[PDB]
């Protein structure tokens, strides 16, 4: 199956949420598992007191827990079972306040309490393919005025990529303010042509990740000795 | 006065809150105005509905706004006032799972949801001294297999320093999680040497804070 996560607080205006429907649409298509699982914390944020509560429980004989801990880990353990129950990941996080979604953050933040994610341990998700879909308002690359300003991009594939050893694939649509702040007006067209062509790597992706369980199986190479 | 914000989590634990505390000594102790307003997001988070409802707000028409919305507004409105209001800031948030304090994303995402604090807008807070106070369990050192790896650090800066633009002084606290992880036995002297060092940090900031 795939899971999906929405961070996205903009609802229909969502360049995220149009770019991963499009990763969605190919998934659908060519996937021997059509089916998809998804949560969207931008509608439904993850509340801002359980993960204190979960880092407490997180060392007490269970026995000796409150309430609000137990409720607290149990939530962390149903949101692993999400992503341990997935073949592959379609992970929409936008840049906000040049730095990370406040709910990926809360939602991450909470999953690293559940014993199978703790440090040390192996990550049960290693080798799996995610595409992460992030867009900006303005333009971030080298030589831009805003180059190191996307403290977000960093993190999250440390934490996919590092961490949880996903195979990442990334889909950035820079320029999504152009037409909305007039100080962007000069990027109207490299804008839009940026926007047609993240559009189809985005349907490239969902293609990608659906045929990934066939690309392994056809994989021969394995690095033994000779 | 002096406003103070805590994000920390581990309570009697927290490295953060004790080390803000030795730059609140120095403010009360040898400052004029030496009154201090304080939140602590770590005992108190903002809610996690509210940045959307604010933002949201922004497209309805105010006569017809949702009280949610409306509300949402004028917490971050009383948020602003806070920092408006304050000669010095002291801002105390730790590095937690590689990335920024979820407690203190929301409250700088809803700060910037005011009018004030908007884009093309002047700092309202250009000039003011600011002490940060953050703290890692590792050592995230140039020359180190953690190098590049608290992707916290630049971002405050990049809003306190770069958006806000206060004079930022940041005292920063390394290996808190030796003692506590028995693999990092192999620092237990170093760890409290760098303990020793940033609690003077601390206090350093403080008399220059007061001053
Ligand atoms: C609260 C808020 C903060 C934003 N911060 C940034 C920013 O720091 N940098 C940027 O390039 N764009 C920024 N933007 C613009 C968004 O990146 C852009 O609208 C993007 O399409 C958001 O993804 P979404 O539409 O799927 O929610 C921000 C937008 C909002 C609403
Ligand atoms: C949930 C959680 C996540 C943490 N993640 C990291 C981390 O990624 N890197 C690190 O060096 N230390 C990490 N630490 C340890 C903290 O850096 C250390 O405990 C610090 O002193 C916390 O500040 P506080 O005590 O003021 O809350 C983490 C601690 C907790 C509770």
Redesign the interface.
Same mark, same amino acid.
């Given at each position: 199956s795939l899971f999906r996560l929405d961070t996205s607080?903009?609802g229909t205006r969502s360049s995220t949420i149009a770019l991963a429907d499009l990763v969605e649409r190919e998934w659908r298509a060519t996937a021997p598992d059509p089916s998809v699982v998804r949560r969207h914390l931008?509608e439904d944020?993850?509340?801002? $007191?359980v993960?204190?509560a979960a880092?407490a429980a997180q060392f007490v004989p269970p026995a000796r827990r409150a309430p609000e801990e137990r409720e607290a880990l149990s939530l962390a353990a149903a949101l692993v079972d999400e992503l341990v129950a997935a073949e592959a990941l379609l992970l929409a996080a936008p840049l906000?306040?040049?730095?990370?979604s406040?709910?990926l953050? $809360?939602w991450?933040?909470l999953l690293?309490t559940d014993p199978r994610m703790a440090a040390g341990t192996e990550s049960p998700l290693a080798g799996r393919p995610a595409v992460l879909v992030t867009a900006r308002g303005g333009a971030y690359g080298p030589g831009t005025p805003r180059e190191? #300003?996307d403290?977000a991009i960093? #993190?999250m594939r440390?934490?996919f990529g590092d961490?949880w050893k996903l195979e990442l694939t990334v889909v950035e649509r820079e320029l999504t303010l152009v037409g909305i702040?007039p100080?962007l007006d000069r990027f109207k067209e490299l804008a839009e042509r940026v926007r047609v062509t993240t559009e189809e790597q985005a349907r490239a992706a969902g293609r990608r990740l659906a045929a990934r369980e066939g690309a392994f199986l056809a994989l021969e190479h394995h690095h033994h000795h000779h």
């Open positions: 607080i903009l931008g944020p993850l509340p801002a $007191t993960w204190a880092v906000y306040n040049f730095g990370v406040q709910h953050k $809360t991450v933040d690293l190191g #300003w403290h960093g #993190w440390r934490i961490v702040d100080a």
